[PDB]
Design a protein around this ligand. Structure first.
Ligand SMILES: NC(=O)c1ccc[n+]([C@@H]2O[C@H](COP(=O)([O-])OP(=O)(O)OC[C@H]3O[C@@H](n4cnc5c(N)ncnc54)[C@H](OP(=O)(O)O)[C@@H]3O)[C@@H](O)[C@H]2O)c1
Ligand SMILES: NC(=O)c1ccc[n+]([C@@H]2O[C@H](COP(=O)([O-])OP(=O)(O)OC[C@H]3O[C@@H](n4cnc5c(N)ncnc54)[C@H](OP(=O)(O)O)[C@@H]3O)[C@@H](O)[C@H]2O)c1
Ligand SMILES: NC(=O)c1ccc[n+]([C@@H]2O[C@H](COP(=O)([O-])OP(=O)(O)OC[C@H]3O[C@@H](n4cnc5c(N)ncnc54)[C@H](OP(=O)(O)O)[C@@H]3O)[C@@H](O)[C@H]2O)c1
Ligand SMILES: NC(=O)c1ccc[n+]([C@@H]2O[C@H](COP(=O)([O-])OP(=O)(O)OC[C@H]3O[C@@H](n4cnc5c(N)ncnc54)[C@H](OP(=O)(O)O)[C@@H]3O)[C@@H](O)[C@H]2O)c1
Ligand SMILES: NC(=O)c1ccc[n+]([C@@H]2O[C@H](COP(=O)([O-])OP(=O)(O)OC[C@H]3O[C@@H](n4cnc5c(N)ncnc54)[C@H](OP(=O)(O)O)[C@@H]3O)[C@@H](O)[C@H]2O)c1
Ligand SMILES: N[C@H](CCC[C@H](N)C(=O)O)C(=O)O
Ligand SMILES: N[C@H](CCC[C@H](N)C(=O)O)C(=O)O
Lengths: 297, 297, 297, 297, 297, 297
């Protein structure tokens, strides 16, 4: 029923299309791309592809599957048209500001926006909140990898001279990580300059980063990723409460599925902007509540 | 700030008291017990203890730490007084109905009730809900133990002729569980009788149960418990997404802590009755939302 | 490049197509299906689809992605046309016999056939052989699941009255397995008779099998599967040598990828029929040998 | 049976003898040592021990259990006498070159040579090849230890001044390793110079190496070793395929057992030089093929 | 039966009190504190609390739950009074000397002293001793954490300017540890100064230490800790024997419990001073030996 | 220095010989066998083998490596000659009686005896005692396997008609085990009768046992074994204390090494009989105590 459009046909966008088609409560009106070539990708045969969302039926919701750094602008554009929006904006240091920014825009145009709705930020944030209130005193650790960071990869591919890139995240334990970036340079690019731009990027300035040039990125790339979140803390006055959550998943696949759920929820909220911990988890499930209560609680 | 009362001073009740005292946004007005002897238990020295909640300040919320089967009547009594209530009612097949029964009573008295707010039902429910929407197709398994089930223990304890009892839950894998009950009989009691009663209790009727008489239950009892929840499912059209969540904790201590977070949440809801998946996870955290968003998302 | 055709567009066939397309030394000529409807599934847009392999260019090799019980007939058909063939025939009981049956047919038509080339039988077989000669004395245990057995699922779907079916394999440990079948019955079929047919099928008669009728098989089905192969044996006269191999993979995806490698190898062999342990592992890698030796040995 | 001689009665040689004695298809003709003292070690009682392979019956195959840096010369010597040879040459850097060097010598004398046939290089190489074709895209990580590297230990023992030495390999993760060397110095030798020689030896120059002088190497030495080989890759176009192989074994025991199997295979090959991935796995099993197919595939 | 006194009411002291009360063969005569305020802590309601052990019954044994560096003087004082003593003195390099110093003082006053009786030193020592004689050759590694070190915390706490502190121990593997100190400073204190003092404390001088100032230590502190002890060694002439021991426990609670068992043991020894490996493990069990032999051996 | 004899040259006995030769504080005077053939086993060349201990020098201690059921009689024989004795008598239900039986015999002849000194009973008993006093309330689980039980194997080999046997122990979790016995029958034996005798044996009457006839036991036999002992209990009043100990070892190898340590200890005790929990663990280590204190505590 909910009419949706996938914006940005990249990694997450391609899985988003599949997530929307499998969804029992949604309808894929079309796909919004920067350009639409005469050669139609196999999986888009029979799918409406356009350069502007307005040329797409009566779109009520949009999955913003574009680069994180482009999320703010797209989000505002869709919101100003009264279209609910979901994105997986992953900059932890700024998403709280983005929410305050989109809130009024969303409210004034009678729509809802759910930002940072991937697995991290996203579902892992809900997990961190659970662990936070289950054992208030202590420390939580979120260890990523080994795997591909779609966000870091996009930032490297954005560097001039980079034909293609793979940003891998390696867990060093205790919340600390190391990053290995493999770059496929364009003919004429200067490795040293590309290395400088990578390490200077805010995405990379806080972690030990190692850049290596390679002949082929696709030969080394696997979009799989994972996480291990752990907490050793106190329940009331009771110490040594141990919690552990782990995933070994297809990064883009899970992100897109989560984004779909967040949009299902966005369409149920009062106009405004939300992060995933501000929405009752039942709003992420399709259909009436009763059945989910009996099945899950 | 929030004035609270712990109702029922047993296992969970003891930890509930500690959980409330450690919470930054709550004040423990007192403890409600069926009886108050002249001999004051040490941890209660300096704590108001009465047989009726009416003799306690201006109690705004109450943690119902009484037997599961006694929860319905207690919740209705506190609600009819305008007191928010939280309980850890653990009968999965019935809780949905309990929610529908308490909803109107809660609403008509301007109060909010959060039922089944322990770790399972409770937080494990929120977890199951996440796994469900992160990968809509497939199967989720919840394996408990090895550990003590406070609920099953209470049930056995109530049986006539049982001086004390320990109900252990053993994980057989794939969601199947074996139950081992260690019962300490009262002088001159019919074992075969107690045994028969145990096996046919709705709490035991569905699982493979073994009963063994022992000289001392306290010599064998440890209130530790744990869980392993797993899901192998499909995100969109992408198969083999793997998720795993595990806990190894003091059972009653976690439950009491979760109940505390839930009551905090209850005081923030519109009058009515809710299960934990019907509340935004951030309302379980004390204080303003903004800081929690920067820290967790 | 090796001109290749995919026979049977089911689960394995779907991934097989993707496997061939990604292969650097192969060209996908077309797909052979029992029938070709006017409605072209998206992924087959631009792909030649016929009902007889002879209407496909100059096919040199064929991937028999048909039901295991149909493999012998397809293989002979293909072999009699000078086309190398590969299948994932999974009946351990008599695959050795199939090999003896196809050997002369393959030799007399100047073609090679590599049978039972999935992950088990297939790659797991090579692993069992290594374990076997690395520690000649002791016992090997191959534990499957939890996951979907594509072969058992196909067998159940073939029973009259079954609309759709899922056969999951559960590891009981020590090489023992339990099978849980979920069936979506056809309007009118009798559960009891379908259940009897499933339990007595040669695929299930040797394992504790449980059958359950469900409303939706697709809601529970995930094609992921896995294995844990272990061996505690003797090297020479030195006891307690410990080996362990494990996989958590997309079942049909891996099967098809292996079939492509097996076909690559098939084209390099003398005319005849082989199992995977009768072929040097290097023949499964594309291109000249030298590079793989330096990279892998 | 295949008449076999063990060349080099060191660690590997000792287990090699036991491996041959347990082999159903082999006969131990004798052992070749640099010298034969009048004091016969217990285990060699009844075993013919000479200084030149020609004084051994009619030896058809030889296990070169000599230092890796001595292998090329021994292999050629043996091959020039029409004797099939097997070694565990472990220098990954140029074993491919050794193979090209021995190929003609082996072919021109009608004998077969299987080089680098230990567990790594050796069996682990076959495993890396399988992983390679099961999931063509992604990266493989081979993590060693904690344990004793027989090869690095031999190199250290060869340095002037070293009375005895132990070189342990420590897994740092992601294919990275740290090496901890324990040396028992000869009366008078200088630690600083021995330390320098160790650290700059080609065996150690590529890894973070630490050297420590000890009073007794035998007190710390255990020949056990292990490995964890992992791969997260793509099958066809399906990402996140997870594979893991692990062993906890007696290093030299396994090495010698594999060498025996490699020699068994060597005798079945056309004259020439091979690595283990160039030989069908079934040639490593004793006796007719049929039985192994039924038992393993 | 055995009349006991808990000396020092801090972390371990609190649990020591609980440990003594639960022990079947002991009576808690009282608690010795440097000061006794009019405000009686709830758990001490009904417990005799004094500033000198002479004001407590006929104390026969004392648990010295005071800072490690204060243990020597306290032990000598209790011993000179004929009181058996147990402590958890954790300085590994010094304890042997402490044993030689307390031995005569203990003997000349007809008392027994068991030093360093926590879990490490203490029970972990007994464990290391077993692994040592079960496999005499090889190496044992003791990896602590993640968790809080009561000892290191006390040390930091004592530093001038530190209001409160949390010393966490992180396992780097192979016996190496990283230390993370979280310090809550007193108003107007020099961080760089406190930081400098910490890093040079004998407790910290040998390991990689990081110091971080925080607003609240209690918000981060959890007294849980753990350990993983492993040994790969030789039993006789048989290599690769693998042993592994792990604990995940409430640090101060286990220590207090072990100290209780040790004191029980102390009252059973000939006058003098002992470490835990110098006492038959059965003297740590209450009551007659016969039953323990039937139950444990 | 301590002069020792190995009695019974079977599995444990052969490793016992090696354990004694590696021991720094012992001397192997000889081996006592029921018979001594003209053909000397390789490893006994240079070792004195006789049919009666009296023909062995000045034997001060003896390792009784004979069947458990023969231990009582041998133990008494050696003790009556003033020879310390060690055995690995594994019948848990009776060893407590055996101790009371040997005690007076040992004392009257001025010797010491350490019974049930293997790994279980033996070192695992010491482990169980530690866990018992570290957390008094709770339950301990000892899970064996998969592996070979030397004791059960001996009992089956003792059955008339059994040419050779392998008794494997499989862990079913929670202290429960299953037993798989593989028997190689003599020509003429009756499988049914052998099966009856196996299942009737006290060694097998308390566990689910399955007997299978096979052509070769040596083809399936691996003397490796292991254990996982776990405890979830209370330290004082603190619940959920988690402990876990695991071993993957050469069964006979470890048993013999432990027996050697027990004898080293036996020679340090006052005349009498002991189980391993009645001896300070330091007495199991060679040489002066001081060094072990500084190294282990
Ligand atoms: N858990 C999380 O929160 C989480 C997880 C995974 C991913 N993510 C986020 O997902 C974002 C996208 O990932 P991806 O791998 O799909 O990236 P991608 O493959 O580059 O796809 C982005 C698509 O947006 C469009 N696009 C590219 N550059 C653009 C630009 N500069 N301006 C406007 N549109 C542009 C393109 O689609 P068209 O060519 O069709 O226009 C492009 O294919 C990442 O930045 C990452 O931060 C977050
Ligand atoms: N490791 C292993 O060795 C291993 C692993 C996985 C799978 N396998 C084998 O793979 C086989 C196929 O699995 P799958 O999941 O791909 O089955 P599937 O999804 O049912 O597809 C089989 C295809 O075979 C073609 N076909 C030809 N004759 C058929 C017939 N008589 N009945 C039904 N279909 C027929 C059909 O394609 P068209 O409609 O296009 O004609 C059908 O879609 C299984 O039987 C299993 O034994 C082996
Ligand atoms: N996976 C693998 O591929 C793998 C694994 C394990 C070991 N290896 C290889 O095995 C090789 C041997 O290991 P090891 O532990 O058996 O060494 P070792 O204990 O030192 O024995 C080597 C034997 O070689 C003979 N020898 C002939 N020439 C020699 C020389 N020039 N210097 C010293 N000895 C000489 C000696 O026997 P005589 O005294 O009887 O002449 C010596 O005992 C290592 O170099 C290692 O690279 C490979
Ligand atoms: N496995 C082990 O061996 C192991 C494990 C855990 C802990 N420990 C040891 O336990 C020791 C104590 O730990 P904790 O956490 O209980 O420390 P704590 O919380 O500071 O308690 C020590 C108590 O001793 C008294 N005290 C403090 N400073 C003193 C001083 N300067 N002189 C005399 N008395 C003093 C105080 O009790 P009053 O106020 O009542 O006088 C204080 O509460 C640590 O030093 C650690 O080394 C050893
Ligand atoms: N943790 C433990 O407590 C533990 C662990 C492992 C083993 N064990 C015990 O070790 C015992 C022996 O194990 P094993 O594998 O060495 O058995 P084994 O291989 O049969 O060796 C026993 C030896 O004693 C002699 N012997 C055999 N039968 C005898 C008889 N009926 N009367 C007198 N002597 C006899 C023989 O030596 P000769 O031919 O040289 O006379 C025989 O080789 C087992 O019963 C088991 O209970 C205990
Ligand atoms: N921050 C983690 C997880 C990022 C997940 C998602 N934001 C992505 O871009 O892959 C990383 O560095 O891998
Ligand atoms: N009771 C356990 C361990 C026995 C260890 C030792 N007593 C043996 O005979 O192997 C079993 O059934 O395997």
């Amino acid at each position: 029923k909910l009419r949706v459009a996938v914006v940005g046909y990249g990694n997450v966008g391609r899985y988003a299309l599949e997530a929307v088609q499998a969804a029992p409560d949604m309808e894929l009106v079309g796909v919004v791309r920067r350009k639409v070539l005469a050669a139609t990708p196999p999986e888009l045969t029979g799918v409406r592809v356009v350069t502007d969302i307005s040329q797409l039926e009566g779109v009520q919701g949009a999955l913003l599957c574009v680069p994180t750094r482009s999320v703010p602008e797209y989000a505002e554009a869709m919101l100003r048209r009264g279209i609910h929006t979901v994105d997986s904006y992953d900059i932890h240091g700024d998403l709280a500001d983005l929410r305050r920014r989109l809130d009024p825009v969303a409210r004034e145009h009678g729509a809802a926006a759910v930002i940072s709705a991937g697995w991290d930020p996203g579902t892992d944030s809900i997990i961190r909140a659970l662990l936070e209130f289950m054992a208030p005193k202590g420390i939580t650790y979120t260890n990523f990898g080994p795997g591909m960071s779609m966000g870091h990869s996009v930032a490297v591919k954005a560097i001039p001279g980079v034909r293609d890139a793979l940003s891998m995240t390696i867990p060093a334990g205790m919340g600390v990580h190391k990053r290995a970036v493999y770059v496929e340079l364009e003919p004429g690019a200067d490795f040293a300059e590309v290395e400088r731009a990578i390490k200077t990027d805010p995405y990379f300035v806080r972690d030990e980063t190692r850049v290596t040039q390679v002949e082929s990125v696709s030969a080394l790339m696997d979009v799989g990723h994972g996480v291990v979140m752990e907490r050793k803390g106190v329940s009331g006055a009771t110490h040594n409460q141990l919690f552990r959550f782990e995933m070994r998943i297809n990064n883009p696949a899970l992100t897109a599925q989560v984004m779909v759920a967040a949009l299902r929820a966005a369409a149920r909220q009062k106009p405004g902007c939300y992060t995933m911990i501000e929405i009752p988890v039942i709003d992420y499930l399709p259909g009436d509540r009763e059945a989910w209560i009996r099945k899950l609680v």
